[PDB]
Design a binder for this molecule. Structure first.
Ligand code: PLM
Length: 133
């Protein structure tokens, strides 16, 4: 059941995003702009296919995928990764693999807010999104 994740979401809090992006090898200037950017994430479904848009004044991305089926992805920071998204414990878990590395993007609804936890290396970033009507 992915349905409570669907809709338009706006970033309202961020913790440790610089640590996360730095761990991925993102350069200082991009990290600087990212620290002041508040994306909008739009999650939509059509049958078995989810589409996840991330929009901002800096970078935009869009992916479409079926839960549990690997897909190719080119991330906002230009990594070419092998990805899979599943539901696990009611959380939407996105795993990216490239060059033997991994990162996870885990989304979980808590009190109506969408909490995105990003882990790479030892870095753990928590970002909070609120629903927009
Ligand atoms: C959409 C603006 C992002 C700007 C950051 C660019 C370099 C870091 C990108 C890291 C991977 C994507 C992180 C997504 C974060 C999110 O959806 O809130």
């Amino acid at each position: 059941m992915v349905d409570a994740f669907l809709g338009t979401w706006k970033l309202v809090d961020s913790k440790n995003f610089d640590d996360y992006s730095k761990s991925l090898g993102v350069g200082f200037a991009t990290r600087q702009v990212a620290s002041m950017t508040k994306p909008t994430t739009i999650i939509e479904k059509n049958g078995d296919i989810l589409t996840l848009k991330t929009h901002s004044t800096f970078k935009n991305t869009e992916i479409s995928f079926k839960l549990g089926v690997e897909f190719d992805e080119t991330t906002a920071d230009d990594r070419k990764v092998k990805s899979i998204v599943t539901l696990d414990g009611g959380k939407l878990v996105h795993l990216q693999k490239w060059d033997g590395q991994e990162t996870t993007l885990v989304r979980e609804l808590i009190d109506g807010k969408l909490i995105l936890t990003l882990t790479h290396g030892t870095a753990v970033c928590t970002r909070t999104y609120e629903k927009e009507a």
